[PDB]
C-alpha cells in the first residue's frame, strides 16, 4: 500500500583497493552494521581515499572506480540507487542500462584515474581482493586472462578497472566469460564509452 512503500538504500563505500605503493591490498573502512545504517540514511561521514572503492548495497557488493572526476560502476550492481555522502544521498549523474554503466560525482578525497590514450593491448584487471590480473585485450570490450581461474575469484569485482601498463584506465569490468566455471575472458565498458557519455 502507499502508506508502507519502502525506498531502496544508497550504495555505500565500505573499503578500497590500496594502490598507493608496491603492494596492492584491500582495506575495509566500514563494517556490515554501519554499512546498513549508512545505506538507510545515505549519510556517510567517512573519509574517502584512492581510485578503486569497494561498495555495497543491502544485498550485493562490488567495486567502483574514479575516472575523470566520476565514480563509475555497473548498473547490475547499483541499479538507479543514490550513493551515500557526507551531506546525504547523491543522485547518479550517468545511467546507461545498455552499457551496464552508472556514475556519480567522485567523492571528495578520491583520486581519479586518467583515461588511457596509449592504444596498448597489455592490460591489468584489479579485483576486490587486490589481485592484479594480466589481461590481453582482444577487442573493443573484451580481453583474455593470461592465467584463467574459476569465476569465484572474479565475483564481486565488477566496476573495477582494467589499466594499461602506465596505470591509465582502459575500461570498467562488467562480465566474465567462462567455460565449465573457469574464467577465460572478461568484458568491460571501454573508457571511450565513458568519455562519450560524459
Ligand atoms: C539489470 O540490468 C542490467 C543491464 C546490463 C547488464 N550487462 C551484463 C553483461 C550483465 O551480466 C550479468 C552480471 C554480470 C556479472 O556477474 N559481473 C561480474 C561481477 O563480479 N558481478 S558482481 O558479483 O560484482 C554483482 C552481481 C554486482 C554484485 C564480473 C563478474 C564475475 C563473475 C561472473 C559470475 C557468473 C556470471 C557470468 C556473467 N557472464 C556474462 O554475462 O558473460 C557475457 C555473455 C559477456 C556478457 C556475468 O559476468 N554477469 C551477468 N548483467 C546486466 C544487468
Ligand atoms: Zn595508457
Author numbering: 982 to 1179
What text comes from the article?
The NS3/4A protease is an excellent target for developing DAAs against HCV, and protease inhibitors have been a key component of most combination therapies. This essential protease cleaves the HCV polyprotein into functional units necessary for viral replication and maturation. Structurally Asp168 is a critical residue that contributes to an active-site electrostatic network necessary for efficient inhibitor binding. We rationally designed HCV protease inhibitors that retain potency while fitting within the substrate envelope to avoid resistance, particularly against D168A, which confers high-level resistance to current HCV PIs.
